[PDB]
Design a protein around this ligand. Structure first.
Ligand SMILES: *O[C@H]1[C@H](O)[C@@H](NC(=O)C[C@@H](CCCCCCCCCCC)OC(=O)CCCCCCCCCCCCC)[C@H](OC[C@H]2O[C@H](*)[C@H](NC(=O)C[C@H](O)CCCCCCCCCCC)[C@@H](OC(=O)C[C@H](O)CCCCCCCCCCC)[C@@H]2O)O[C@@H]1CO[C@]1(C(=O)O)C[C@@H](O)[C@@H](O)[C@@H]([C@H](O)CO)O1
Ligand SMILES: *[C@@H]1O[C@H](CO[C@@H]2O[C@@H](C)[C@@H](O)[C@@H](O)[C@@H]2O)[C@@H](O[C@@H]2O[C@H](CO)[C@@H](O)[C@H](O)[C@H]2NC(C)=O)[C@H](O)[C@H]1NC(C)=O
Ligand SMILES: *[C@@H]1O[C@H](CO)[C@@H](O[C@@H]2O[C@H](CO)[C@@H](O)[C@H](O)[C@H]2NC(C)=O)[C@H](O)[C@H]1NC(C)=O
Ligand SMILES: *[C@@H]1O[C@H](CO[C@@H]2O[C@@H](C)[C@@H](O)[C@@H](O)[C@@H]2O)[C@@H](O)[C@H](O)[C@H]1NC(C)=O
Ligand SMILES: CCCCCCCCCCCCCC(=O)O
Ligand SMILES: [Ca+2]
Ligand SMILES: [Ca+2]
Ligand SMILES: [Ca+2]
Lengths: 94, 413
């Protein structure tokens, strides 16, 4: 919960920044990321499988360009727990 | 892990982690032929995994005339004079092993910044991921105390091996990321040493932060180990060690870290995830992890300088407790020493090599000493012990060249 938030922000950060440096879509950077994983452990296969099956459904939740904190809260990987402050790694607009 | 069939698997995994012994260990002597999963990245490689009486650090039965019972690559008989090679070359050389009872720093926790830095990311960036993960994100094989591979100033183990080749493969890194005085008892149990059948050992107890770095969900000060708790915990640990260690062993209690260095050095510098758009510093990393209540050290990774100072003060108080134990308590089977955390010496040594202090901290986690720092600490420990207590390290073996001539690389690591 507090681990899934961290893991989501890490992974989404890499996807978004990898898209930025290639001027690419998020679909393209996700596929690029899988491309970089090793064959061992069925990581690259699991990766590719994950990206094709769910990727588009996830991207379609977003009609706007938002940072990793927003993405991960929207996907409910970062939840606002009762009694705890809102957590974010990147700067807030405004 | 909540599914019923899948949960029985999850419970079993956690059980292997926590016991801190190799999963690949057919004879159950805690030494492995496989590198990760607590294998020979962590301790000397088992030269016979079908025999619990063959493992690193053992006294050589029959002087290893017939086989290499202690895996140091020295064995057999000289046909010239009928004398076993290990008697000729090691008798009287007082071999000893190195054992680290440590934490994430002692295990050398390291997340490659290449996994998170897109500007340089490539097909090669993740080749090490399965090794790292099955080593609990530690790199003991490259660590300052027990490292034996090509450093990315070398390790305590390799210096001991260089001093006396008979010490080949006699290393054990019994460190766990979350270890402290509160749980070092479980580590004592994963240690391998027989008080009567093995060589003596140098044991370094180096819990440099976790006794002050808990409190992730409460006032951290109220969570930190107190001097009385640590005194009791360490005394019980030392009594347990006294029943494992061969006579002639040595135990070094190492002081806690100067953790205030972290905020002072890093609070305005960019994290790897912040380098592309210059939008994340370690200040934000520390706040983020603290907000999520998963901060690895809330007391030192705080913008509240009063909290940082209280954390440092407790760290100094606990270090003085270790010094008191070493000054006042005595154990039959080992000499006991205290060493301060050599912060100033390491930072000065680094600056004279042209380094900047921020280059001594793991870039991704902003917490642990990195590979360079750990080898500098090892260098400072070696020289200080050599200068003050040379008996701890032993004499140079005059037959090292003979060992090398007859046995070469002694079987490698
Ligand atoms: O169930 C037990 C808990 O598991 C245990 N917690 C752990 O020990 C901490 C583990 C959890 C791992 C979760 C994530 C798993 C995925 C890892 C695989 C990697 C995939 C690649 O965490 C780790 O040890 C560190 C893992 C970091 C992983 C980051 C990978 C980054 C790769 C990026 C990939 C991108 C690709 C594109 C819990 O223990 C209790 C406490 O014990 C002490 C422990 N402290 C130490 O370990 C401190 C040590 O110095 C290590 C510090 C590491 C800091 C890393 C910072 C990274 C920042 C990254 C940039 C943003 C405490 O742990 C922590 O301090 C660790 C810290 O909180 C983790 C920070 C970041 C997590 C990121 C997750 C990313 C996920 C993967 C991304 C895809 C522990 O809190 O104890 C429970 C069981 O507990 C109890 C019990 O039930 O009995 C209860 C306790 O209260 C306690 O009392 C004990 C008793 O005392 C026992 O007697 O037992
Ligand atoms: C690793 O050791 C095994 C086992 O050694 C035998 O059993 C031990 C428990 C101990 O009693 C030793 O003294 C024994 O030699 C070795 O396997 C045996 O090797 C001999 C041949 O020399 C043969 O008679 C046996 O059948 C083998 N197997 C068993 C189960 O005994 C093995 O050779 C050793 N490996 C290496 C690389 O030296
Ligand atoms: C800085 O940290 C210290 C230590 O956690 C805080 O002191 C605590 O303050 C709270 C009141 O809000 C009390 O619960 C405790 O009595 C205090 N602890 C001690 C040891 O005195 C302090 O509040 C923090 N300062 C700021 C500005 O946040
Ligand atoms: C690509 O986007 C550029 C702006 O982004 C910056 O430059 C690129 C090359 C990356 O390095 C990125 O990380 C930087 O933030 C534009 O200047 C350029 O016009 C865009 N390219 C195209 C083909 O439109
Ligand atoms: C768009 C991609 C979404 C990214 C999802 C990554 C989630 C990482 C989860 C981290 C694992 C938590 C482990 C645990 O709960 O103990
Ligand atoms: Ca074995
Ligand atoms: Ca064996
Ligand atoms: Ca031998």
């Amino acid at each position: 919960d507090h681990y899934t938030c961290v893991g989501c922000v890490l992974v989404v950060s890499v996807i978004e920044q990898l898209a930025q440096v290639h001027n690419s879509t998020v679909q393209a950077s996700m596929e690029r990321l899988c491309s970089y994983l090793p064959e061992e452990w069925v990581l690259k296969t699991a990766c590719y499988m994950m990206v094709h099956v769910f990727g588009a459904d996830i991207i379609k939740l977003f009609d706007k360009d938002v940072n990793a904190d927003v993405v991960c809260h929207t996907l409910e990987f970062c939840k606002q727990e009762p009694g705890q402050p809102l957590c974010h790694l990147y700067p807030l607009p405004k | 892990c909540s599914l019923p069939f899948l949960a029985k698997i999850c419970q079993k995994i956690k059980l292997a982690i926590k016991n801190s012994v190799p999963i690949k260990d057919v004879d159950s002597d805690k030494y492995s032929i496989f590198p990760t999963l607590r294998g020979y990245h962590w301790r000397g490689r088992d030269c016979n995994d079908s025999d619990k009486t063959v493992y690193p650090g053992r006294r050589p039965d029959n002087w290893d005339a017939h086989r290499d019972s202690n895996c140091n690559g020295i064995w057999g008989v000289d046909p010239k004079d009928g004398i076993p090679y290990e008697k000729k070359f090691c008798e009287g050389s007082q071999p000893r092993g190195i054992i680290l009872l440590g934490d994430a720093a002692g295990a050398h926790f390291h997340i490659p910044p290449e996994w998170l830095t897109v500007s340089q990311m490539s097909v090669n960036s993740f080749l090490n991921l399965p090794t790292a993960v099955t080593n609990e994100l530690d790199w003991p094989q490259l660590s300052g105390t027990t490292g034996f591979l090509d450093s990315a100033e070398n390790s305590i183990y390799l210096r001991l091996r260089k001093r006396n080749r008979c010490n080949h493969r006699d290393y054990q890194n019994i460190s766990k990321n979350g270890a402290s005085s509160r749980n070092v008892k479980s580590l004592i149990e994963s240690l391998s040493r027989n008080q009567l059948l093995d060589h003596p050992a140098i044991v370094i107890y180096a819990m440099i932060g976790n006794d002050v770095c808990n409190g992730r969900k409460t006032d951290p000060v109220s969570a930190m180990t107190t001097p009385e708790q640590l005194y009791a915990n360490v005394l019980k640990m030392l009594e347990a060690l006294n029943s494992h260690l061969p006579t002639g062993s040595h135990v070094i209690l190492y002081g806690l870290a100067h953790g205030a260095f972290l905020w002072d050095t890093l609070h305005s510098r960019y994290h790897p995830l912040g380098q592309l758009n210059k939008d994340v510093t370690y200040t934000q990393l520390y706040s983020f992890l603290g907000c999520l209540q998963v901060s690895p050290c809330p007391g030192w990774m705080s913008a509240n300088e009063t909290l940082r100072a209280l954390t440092s003060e407790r760290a100094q108080q606990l270090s003085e407790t270790l010094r008191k134990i070493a000054a006042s308590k005595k154990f039959t089977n080992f000499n006991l020493f205290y060493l301060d955390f050599a912060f100033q010496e390491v930072v000065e040594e680094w600056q004279k090599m042209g380094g900047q202090p921020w280059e001594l901290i793991e870039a991704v986690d902003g917490f642990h000493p990195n590979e360079v720092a750990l080898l500098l600490f090892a260098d400072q420990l070696w020289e200080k012990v050599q200068r003050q207590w040379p008996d701890v390290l032993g004499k140079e073996n005059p037959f090292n060249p003979q060992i090398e001539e007859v046995f070469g690389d002694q079987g490698g690591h």
